[PDB]
Amino acid sequence: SMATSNPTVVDIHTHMYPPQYIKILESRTTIPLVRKFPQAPEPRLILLEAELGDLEKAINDPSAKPPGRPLTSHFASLDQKIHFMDTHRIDISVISLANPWLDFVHASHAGDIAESVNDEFSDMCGKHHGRLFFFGTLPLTAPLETLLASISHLAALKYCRGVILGTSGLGKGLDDPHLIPIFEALAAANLTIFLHPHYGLPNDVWGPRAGEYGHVLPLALGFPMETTIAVARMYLAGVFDQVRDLRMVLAHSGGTLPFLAGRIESCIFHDGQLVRQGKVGENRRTVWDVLKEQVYLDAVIYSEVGLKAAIDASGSDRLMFGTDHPFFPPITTDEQGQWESVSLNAQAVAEAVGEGSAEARAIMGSNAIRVLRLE
């Protein structure tokens, strides 16, 4: 019995909220916040602009449908994380703080809250040696020297393997030139970036009836689209050519990137301004080059259709399995049993590359172990 018969399964897309972070979320009035209501036995976690028109309604009425999503024991409990892993035959998790990280924290307290949280994550991973690693979080509201010291901390921090971060960066996007030395620091520290959505799109794009459709529009369309816009702006700004040893893992198989790379390239090629400014040269690095050299994709796509396009774009050696625990728990079955949300992704892997093939082993664990040095 050997490694191939009994492979190491790894989930690289799995979130927590440590107790301190909830303490902050509870003591808040604007997004993000956690607030207990009488009807639902669990505190309601409210994170999105779309959840707002339901919060302003459930504050002036105790009969109204509860806002946001349930804050369960799955967000905070580590034993809960381990239990989920054991039920789903996951061997190793790479845990990360969930959206919106520290992006709202005031510039002054940010650094210290960052240090505290990342220390906590490292302690958690310490509780189960071998099975836990983490993407740390950055205080991007803090000024440059705090940021750099934070990165230095992470690079020294046990069990750490990268950082997770959203698409606003320093408040101007990811193509913001002031971001560069931070990328450079990350790159030099060998800290892999897990880029992840949160802000989605302007709430108005969803139309008037949007509340009839639950969280579907913002979570299924808004998140992946946000990720695609972020990375495409990163790319058009030249961040990848400029910071060559930068390594990013995109949430939700790059959002819609694999599907649109063709279109992006064709649009570049055919852009009057871009060609006449000498930007469409023949030695240019394409979206495809970045997709094969600098960017990795998670396999959180829920179907072999998307998974197959993701694999086409990046290669099966650049895909990594995830679950997005615990944001999509079972409603009508036991939260302690099998999660449909996991089994869809496993099924997509199986249908895309075959059960037990070498590509399946790579996507289910090996790629992650190699790329994120999980020793």
Q: Which of residues 30-89 bind Zn ion (CB under 5 A)?
A: none
The region of 89-97, 111-119, 307-315, 322-330 touching Zn ion under the rule CB under 5 A is: 322-330
Q: Which two tokens stand for residue 279?
A: 């930007």
Q: Is 324 in the site for Zn ion (CB under 5 A)?
A: yes
Closest listed residue to residue 46, CA positions, set 25, 26, 32: 32
Cα separation values, 152 from 49, 166, 190, 195, 326, Å:
34, 20, 11, 19, 30
Tell me the closest approach of the beta carbon of residue 59 to Zn ion, in angstroms.
27
Tell me the closest approach of the beta carbon of residue 196 to Zn ion, in angstroms.
6
Nearer to a copy of itself, 126 or 330 (CB): 330
* C-alpha gyration radius of the chain: 20
CB-based contact 150:114 (threshold 8 Å):
yes
Instruction: From the list Zn ion, a copy of itself, none, pick the one residue 148 interacts with, judged by a Cβ distance below 5 to 8 Å according to partner type.
Output: none
CB-based contact 205:141 (threshold 8 Å):
no
Q: Is 298 in the site for Zn ion (CB under 5 A)?
A: no
Phi, psi for 191 (deg, rounded to 5)? -95, 110
Tell me the closest approach of the beta carbon of residue 209 to a copy of itself, in angstroms.
5
Residue 196 assigned to a binding site: yes
Nearer to a copy of itself, 221 or 369 (CB): 221
Nearer to a copy of itself, 19 or 272 (CB): 272
Residue 13 assigned to a binding site: yes
Tell me the closest approach of the beta carbon of residue 313 to a copy of itself, in angstroms.
5
Nearer to a copy of itself, 104 or 288 (CB): 288
Residue 145 burial by CB count (10 A; 0-12/13-18/19+): exposed, middle or buried? exposed
Beta bridge partner(s), residue 361:
none
Instruction: From the list Zn ion, a copy of itself, none, pick the one residue 129 interacts with, judged by a Cβ distance below 5 to 8 Å according to partner type.
Output: none
The region of 168-176, 224-232, 283-291, 323-331 touching Zn ion under the rule CB under 5 A is: 323-331
Residue 106 assigned to a binding site: no
Task: Select the residue whose beta carbon is closest to Zn ion and give its number.
Answer: 324
The region of 80-88, 89-97, 160-168, 320-328 touching Zn ion under the rule CB under 5 A is: 320-328
Nearer to a copy of itself, 162 or 258 (CB): 258
Amino acid present at 21: Y
Nearer to a copy of itself, 108 or 338 (CB): 338
Tell me the closest approach of the beta carbon of residue 159 to Zn ion, in angstroms.
20
The 3-state DSSP composition of the chain as helix, strand, coil percent (nearest 5) reads: 50, 15, 40
CB-based contact 31:49 (threshold 8 Å):
yes
Tell me the closest approach of the beta carbon of residue 181 to a copy of itself, in angstroms.
18
Nearer to a copy of itself, 76 or 274 (CB): 274
What beta strand segments (E) does 166-228 contain? 192-195
Instruction: From the list Zn ion, a copy of itself, none, pick the one residue 266 interacts with, judged by a Cβ distance below 5 to 8 Å according to partner type.
Output: a copy of itself
Amino acid present at 346: A
Strands, sheet with 132-137, edge to edge from the N-terminal-most edge strand: 10-16, 92-97, 132-137, 160-165, 192-195, 248-250, 295-298, 319-320
Handedness of CA 172, 175, 181, 186 (dihedral sign): positive
Q: How far apart are the first and last CA of the chain?
A: 21
Q: Is 226 in the site for Zn ion (CB under 5 A)?
A: no
Residue positions in the annotated binding site? 13, 15, 196, 324
| Site residues, Zn ion (CB under 5 A) | 324
Residue positions in the annotated binding site for Zn(2+)? 13, 15, 196, 324
